[PDB]
Amino acid sequence: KLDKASKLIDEENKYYARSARINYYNLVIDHAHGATLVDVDGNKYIDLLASASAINVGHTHEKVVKAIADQAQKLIHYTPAYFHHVPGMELSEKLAKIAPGNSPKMVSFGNSGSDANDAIIKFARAYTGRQYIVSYMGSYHGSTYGSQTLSGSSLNMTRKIGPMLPSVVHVPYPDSYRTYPGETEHDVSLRYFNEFKKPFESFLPADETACVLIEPIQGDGGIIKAPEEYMQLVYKFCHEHGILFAIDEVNQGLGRTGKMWAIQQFKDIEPDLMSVGKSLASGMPLSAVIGKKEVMQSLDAPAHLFTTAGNPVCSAASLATLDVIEYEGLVEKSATDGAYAKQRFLEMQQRHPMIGDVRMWGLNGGIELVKDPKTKEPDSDAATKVIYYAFAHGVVIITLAGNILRFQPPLVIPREQLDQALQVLDDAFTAVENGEVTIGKIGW
Amino acid sequence: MGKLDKASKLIDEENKYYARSARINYYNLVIDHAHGATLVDVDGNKYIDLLASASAINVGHTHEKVVKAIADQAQKLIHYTPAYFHHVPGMELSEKLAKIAPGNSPKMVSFGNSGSDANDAIIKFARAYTGRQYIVSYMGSYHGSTYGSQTLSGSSLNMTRKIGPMLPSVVHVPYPDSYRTYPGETEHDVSLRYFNEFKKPFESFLPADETACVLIEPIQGDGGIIKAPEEYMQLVYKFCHEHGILFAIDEVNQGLGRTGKMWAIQQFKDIEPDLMSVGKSLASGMPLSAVIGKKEVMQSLDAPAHLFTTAGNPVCSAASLATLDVIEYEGLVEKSATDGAYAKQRFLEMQQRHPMIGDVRMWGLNGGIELVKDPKTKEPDSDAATKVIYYAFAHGVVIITLAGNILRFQPPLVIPREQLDQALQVLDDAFTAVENGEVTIGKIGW
Amino acid sequence: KLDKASKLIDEENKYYARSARINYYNLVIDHAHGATLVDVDGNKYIDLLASASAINVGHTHEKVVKAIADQAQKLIHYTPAYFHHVPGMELSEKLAKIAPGNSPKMVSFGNSGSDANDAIIKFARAYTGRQYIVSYMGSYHGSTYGSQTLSGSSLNMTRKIGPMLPSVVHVPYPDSYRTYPGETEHDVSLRYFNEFKKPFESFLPADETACVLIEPIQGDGGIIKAPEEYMQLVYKFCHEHGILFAIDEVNQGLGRTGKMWAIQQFKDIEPDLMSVGKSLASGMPLSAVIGKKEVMQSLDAPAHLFTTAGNPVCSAASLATLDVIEYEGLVEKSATDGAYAKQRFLEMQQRHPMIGDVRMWGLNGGIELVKDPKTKEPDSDAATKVIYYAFAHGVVIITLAGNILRFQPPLVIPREQLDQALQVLDDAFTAVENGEVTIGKIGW
Amino acid sequence: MGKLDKASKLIDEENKYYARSARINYYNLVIDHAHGATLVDVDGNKYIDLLASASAINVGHTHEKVVKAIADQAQKLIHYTPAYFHHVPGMELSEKLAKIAPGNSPKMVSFGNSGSDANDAIIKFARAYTGRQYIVSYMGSYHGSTYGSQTLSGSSLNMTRKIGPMLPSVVHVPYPDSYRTYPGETEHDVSLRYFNEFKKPFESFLPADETACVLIEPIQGDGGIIKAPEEYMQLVYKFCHEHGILFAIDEVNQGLGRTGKMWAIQQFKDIEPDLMSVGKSLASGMPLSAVIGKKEVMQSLDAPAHLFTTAGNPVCSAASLATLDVIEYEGLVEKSATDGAYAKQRFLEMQQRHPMIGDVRMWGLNGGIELVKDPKTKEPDSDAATKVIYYAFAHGVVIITLAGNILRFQPPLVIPREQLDQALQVLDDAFTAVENGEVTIGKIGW
Ligand SMILES: CC[C@H](C)[C@@H](NCc1c(COP(=O)(O)O)cnc(C)c1O)C(=O)O
Ligand SMILES: CC[C@H](C)[C@@H](NCc1c(COP(=O)(O)O)cnc(C)c1O)C(=O)O
Ligand SMILES: CC[C@H](C)[C@@H](NCc1c(COP(=O)(O)O)cnc(C)c1O)C(=O)O
Ligand SMILES: CC[C@H](C)[C@@H](NCc1c(COP(=O)(O)O)cnc(C)c1O)C(=O)O
Secondary structure, three states, X not given: OOHHHHHHHHHHHHHEOHHHOXXXXXXXXXXXXXXXXXXXXXXXXXXXXXXXXXXXXXXXXXXXXXXXXXXXXXXXXXXXXXXXXXXXXXXXXXXXXXXXXXXXXXXXXXXOHHHHHHHHHXXXXXXXXXXXXXXXXXXXXXXXXXXXXXXXXXXHXXXXXXXXXXXXXXXXXXXXXXXXXXXXXXXXXXXXXXXXHOHHHOOOXXXXXXXXXXXXXEOOOOOEEOOHHHHHHHHHHHHHHOOEEEEEOOOOOOOOOOOOOHHHHXXXXXXXXXXXXXXXXXXXXXXXXXXXXXXXXXXOOOOOOOOOOOOHHHHHHHHHHHHHHHHOOHHHHHHHHHHHHHHHHHHHHHHOOOEEEEEEOOOOEEEEEEOOOOOOOEOHHHHHHHHHHHHHOOEEOOEEOOOEEEEOOOOOOOHHHHHHHHHHHHHHHHHHHOOOOOOOOOOO | OOOOHHHHHHHHHHHHHEOHHHOOOOOOOEEEEEEEOEEEEOOOOEEEEOOHHHHOOOOOEOOHHHHHHHHHHHHHOOOOXXXXXXXXXXXXXXXXXXXXXXXXXXXXXXXXXXXXXXXXXXXXXXXXXXXXXXXEEEOOOOOOXXXXXXXXXXXXXXXXXXXXXXXXXXXEEOOOOOOOOOXXXXXXXXXXXXXHHHHHHHOOOXXXXXXXXXXXXXXXXXXXXXXXXXXXXXXXXXXXXXXXXXXXXXXXXXXXXOOOOOOHHHHOOOOOOOEEEEOHHHHOOOOOEEEEEEHHHHOOOOOOOOOOOOOOOHHHHHHXXXXXXXXXXXXXXXXXXXXXXXXXXXXXXXXXXXXXXXXXXXXXXXXXXXXXXXXXXXXXXXXXXXHHHHHHHHOOEEOEEEOOOEEEEOOOOOXXXXXXXXXXXXXXXXXXXHHOOOOOOOOOOO | OOHHHHHHHHHHHXXXXXXXXXXXXXXXXXXXXXXXXXXXXXXXXXXXXXXXXXXXXXXXXXXXHHHHHHHHHHOOOOOOOOOEEHHHHHHHHHHXXXXXOOOOEEEEEXXXXXXXXXXXXXXXXXXXXXXXXXXXXXXXXOOOHHHHXXXXXXXXXXXXXXXXXXXXXXXXXXXXXXXXXOOOHHHHHHHHHHHHHHHHXXXXXXXXEEEEEEOOEEOOOOOEEOOHHHHHHHHHHHHHHOOEEEEEOOOOOOOOOOOOOHHHHOOOOOOXXXXXXXXXXXXXXXXXXXXXXXXXXOOOOOOOOOXXXXXXXXXXXXXXXXXXXXXXXXXXXXXXXXXXXXXXXXXXXXXXXXXXXXXXXXXXXXXXXXXXXXXXXXXXXXHHHHHHHXXXXXXXXXXXXXXXXXXXXXXXXXXXXXXXXXXXXXXXXXXXXXXXXXXXXXXX | OOOOHXXXXXXXXXXXXXXXXXXXXXXXXXXXXXEEOEEEEOOOOEEEEOOHHHHOOOOOEOOHHHHHHHHHHHHHOOOXXXXXXXXXXXXXXXXXXXXXXXXXXXXXXXXXXXXXXXXXXXXXXXXXXXXXXXXEEEOOOOXXXXXXXXXXXXOOHHHOOOOOOXXXXXXXXXXXXXXXXXXXXXXXXXXXXXXXXXHHHHOOOOOHHHEEEEEEOOEEOOOOOEEOOHHHHHHHHHHHXXXXXXXXXXXXXXXXXXXXXXXXXXXOOOOOOOEXXXXXXXXXXXXXXXXXXXXHHHOOOOOOOOOOOOOOOHHHHHHHHHHHHHHHHOOHHHHHHHHHHHHHHHHHHHHHHOOOEEEEEEOOOOEEEEEEOOOOOOOEOHHXXXXXXXXXXXXXXXXEEEOOOEEEEOOOOOOOHHHHHHHHHHHHHHHHHHHOOOOOOOOOOO
């Protein structure tokens, strides 16, 4: 069934470095539309990954395809780093405006979420005149040297490549699942905030910290959301010490959580700096750092620019992509379908006790599998068999951190397919319970 | 004059929203559409392109094979990240790049989006393969704007100011200047002198045996189209291999036929890099890059040490396959060599008549025409180069400057001889015009 | 009483940088002996600080004075960095032998605890081929760029001097007083070991960590001892991952804790690397890093040396200093006088509820002062009052961390004097409770 | 032969316990006692000290006033830390040092234990005062063995190997070499060439406006007794003062009369430092050091940014007070100046008869005699230098080498003319004896 796919992968493994791919299964995609992937052997699948939340508006949206094709006929590329073009001008202004909050904003383009997160460091340091950056354990911010240092989701992002960027301090992110007996959401918030302050009470001067960077919901961490009160404490801590408050919206923005921006899951928080990428241009490489105007004015050329950033085709694909999110009401749909999928997985959890935790905000969720509900011991083996059963039954899903099923379908996903995919996962759970699935390095 | 009104207005609006640090400004050129070496602005004016979007447009604007590849690919799959799964344009391209890279040792590839991220990877791969931390790169260099690649760079102080500390364990060395030499020095003197400067850190505080790699532009772009002497490069290459130091090259600006060979390092005798970076022209300006390295080196890391969600995007992969096909079947490597020897002669003739031209440097349709206040002092004359680019722009030619006083000559490799001759004549005219004070002219350039 | 002191201090202030002294009171010491200090105004005091535990054998001990005098007549200095002298030869050998545990050891001399801690970093990195160093929040390791990066007890050891040494990670030290309601010592041990592991489970590879450096009892932190269990877990974690286990015995060695080395308060822990200073030469500038032999052979000259380290006068003084420790049995005497002083402090806590915590291990202690025994809000104002009283009644004592009284008198302090000092401290509490004490920057 | 038995046994026992990286080895000299310029070993052999414990014994070994200050202070108080409290000998010295420092601008002082830690303080104070991060130091320099000062250094690869990453944001520049020059170069050509190298990092990746200080040895010690030319120093001093860069000097080795002025920076016209490190001879080899800077620089930090338990030890402080009085009362500064000019002639005369002497450098009783295999190639001759110090040791003279091939001449400043001439005759004989192959030889030296 995967004869061609397997032959092409075996060839690719001779020429394409293994560090450039987290492998799960032999899926070679030929074409796709909406939430449907078709492989080179003719197998069809429903996509519950959306190329890691880059395909929020669905694969090959008619509108995005046309913008791409039309723009490519006029100009494939002229660098905004030297000169200008219209899609770029129009996009940079539109992004300045749809970013959360009311303060005047400016924008700088990149190619990837990585480089936008490097930008956040640059802009925070330059505006504050301070050097230290605080970021979170469990985070993923990119694979360039700045954003990679801020990250804490894989040891292979640190092994053999150091020394890393200096003056970076990692603090732990609130885990509302593996908690101490009898802890409320209040306790968790306060205990993690207390851990947050320890470096500041010892070796890290708050008056020399340029900024704090946070995923309002951690993606690669395992779809973990900060509690409301935790986040308001951090936010407040930052404004009281003149530390910029920065958000990474690259994974969780553009409607993934059922609001436009995942920071809007929290009350009245306007970031000083934010990174955007992934779904921005429907998987075409474009990113943006968007900060308050006075922060963005603290650097002079050429501190931060890329030859191919704000590519006019990418830009056109992005304008059409933002229009699909508005015109098809994808933010609201994500909230709705997400509430629905939440209820469906909680019901499955009544019948499959390998499901320890159901986290979901919009059509973005982490379904954490454990060996026993009270030890909460991770059971990656179970998760791997679930995704293997899924793949063999027309559903593409992967894991985070070994034992968490990752749920991030295109937001356009028809209800019919959503229900088919959910039924396969229910079936998978039963199969794995029954010993009916068996199995190099898989996943994180 | 009264011909740039729409452009001026759109720019004044853009500047309210788009950070000033994101653009090196020259003139009010807003491109509407383009083809070949011809740009058409939003005001309907037409220009001959002598920049090729900073060497990203080697096959010319909107090549119909590249357009075609983009549109057809987009119809099937806009994206699926090769960081998790696979697609055919990316598989075919990675393989092809491993084979067409310089030399015969087997290679592997890792994709990025930018020349910046590929140079970050060179750091990664070198350190992991060698187990050593120090990186040596050059004064005058440009490697990118991510923290690794930006630290390696040495072409603008605005790439260091207010954003440090930068990446540790990097050392800069001077790049050979063959124009501003000491009186009497030969090419051999220059080579030896700059090799002696290369060795000074290694003879004091920098252990050769803890140095992972030396990264070098075979010809420096942002530095001002400066080529290392043959013998210099041989000594550095030799030194690297006597010490277990990887020899790495940046072919982002000067690869893919720009110098009149496929790769800039092929201007030198029998140098095979361990690691190289590619970008820019790779996919005709679509965002795609690669680090190409020897197979053992590229095997030194495990995932996810280096990957990006949108790197090796299939639309960009398809555009790149089409771009590399065009380069071969249109013979762009050879055309760049032939037209370049021709451009060099035309500029040397111009230098006989216009004493402000201190140095003509050209390898392929890749040149730096360095302007100076006096042939003997060689004092840079930025003001004159700024004047020449303003004159050129006003007569339908788009050209910019490097390091203040150097005219950057990098037109698409497809440039028709008709247009190349029109553009060279306009520059000839510009020199005369500037001599006679006809041209007038906040921060322009580097 | 302090006419001459103040005129002298006033002049010094014009010429000696204020960063170079943590200020408490106008004490200008003219001479001393044992535990008795006499100022230039002829006032007399009892020494409860021992020059930050640098004078364990008491001031101007007759045998150390003689060593100094006699050596200075033969050779004031010849640098062992180029050549050799006998007092240095003899001391290095003796130090290699009296270090804890029985693995063969070698030694390098420095001038300060600070530089011995820089050496720990060098030797750990060199022996392991790894770069990362873990140290603790609340730690104090020194004032040279390496040791100072590792430290975690004053924001003024980081402010304005960065960037600091890279590849250093700080972890939380187990606080056995401000705990969560219900916690045993077992819970504390495991909670703080769980914090220890978090960086190694996110961004810090255990296999690239060269060493963990720990004060067995933290001094500048407030005389905080690590629980036995937490320490066995860290100790084990390092052996399992090839991380070197290193201890700082600069403040807490040489009998301060009632055993020879503070690490001997724990069961069967032989360190890979250790720093020594302070009391080693009676406050004469001398330090050593002592490591397992194979660790110390990982470097070639001149990786770690100083012109004036292992100065022969300093080495003579140290040899004599060590002999007094043995022949006056100060190790035993510290343990006895400390169990005694502990009960005297527990007694005072009965009558003075402002005493929230009594921590004592040998004649080494911290007496923590609070505003309430349940809130445990620190009362810095109280502790400043207590020490200002003590001073005005012939007792030299200082505060750690604002609110913690520091009890570290020379180990040879006579029982008569100890009781004299303790009674002044008793009077001090009552006087402060009755508002009978009134009082820029003081202490930490 | 048969004279070194006790020494050999002792060193052989020492090597089992004392780490090999703590000593640069030359020969089996184990000192029992010394006085003035006379060392006596444990075997009862006698020698003339031409090293002064690396310029730490300027006033001679066991000077009676220094020995007396040590004894007398020890009976009153061996230590009370100035980091917490005060004592009279530290107070007096802190003030004398602020006053005897070069230039008229008011100064403050902070005490350390070692020249290393004083250079670490230079880094901190410079960063703190300017609010800038970058430090510029020299290739060939030695500043110390603590992470800050060690990162500044550039005289041995074993100061960087296996212990990095080092301190970030440090840049090394080359120190002017007036011996191995290009044909025809005057001292003006050297000064300008080395300044042009100084400027290259500031013209590429290092913003002058983000550079906190330059740290320079006025005469390099471990680099081989190399003195910057006057004009090179003026250009650096100038450049610093035009950009808000602190100008900092290390006087640890070359201070306190060694050069035949009180401070080596006084060999230059009208240069006052912002910061200087002092150590070594300060307290006659007892562990004491100071950072001395302009008042306002020293006020840029709050406690405890820079302090040490045993810094400003009262015993070391009294030794230092006595040491400085001896320097003044015995006219040691002028004596180094006079005996220096005399020693220079002598060596210059030896050069005529022994052509292996390639270069004679001398400023005070402070010289490097550089041995080469040929006058025109200037190829280092380590072998010859090592043979000379072995001849020398055998005939009652203790001298060592710098950089392989450079004889280090740094006797106590109080050395009597008869001993000086005794030791100079031995060296004259050494040369001739090595020319005849009469001398035989782990790693020796640097
Ligand atoms: C290829 C997918 C990546 C391994 C990872 N996402 C990348 C990411 C990034 C980096 O984005 P790129 O540089 O575009 O990959 C930045 N911020 C967050 C919150 C991210 O999740 C993920 O979603 O698994
Ligand atoms: C926008 C253009 C850029 C400022 C500059 N070239 C970028 C470049 C880069 C960086 O490539 P990107 O990250 O794709 O901009 C890497 N290596 C070399 C040799 C380069 O020249 C240039 O050609 O001027
Ligand atoms: C001046 C005294 C110091 C501020 C401080 N102790 C210095 C110290 C040091 C540094 O020793 P020095 O470099 O000799 O000051 C190293 N390790 C520990 C555990 C230390 O406590 C103290 O005990 O308060
Ligand atoms: C032990 C002798 C040392 C290897 C070396 N000098 C130490 C030194 C130092 C360091 O002094 P300490 O840290 O006291 O050794 C600082 N600055 C200069 C210019 C120095 O020369 C020397 O003079 O050979």
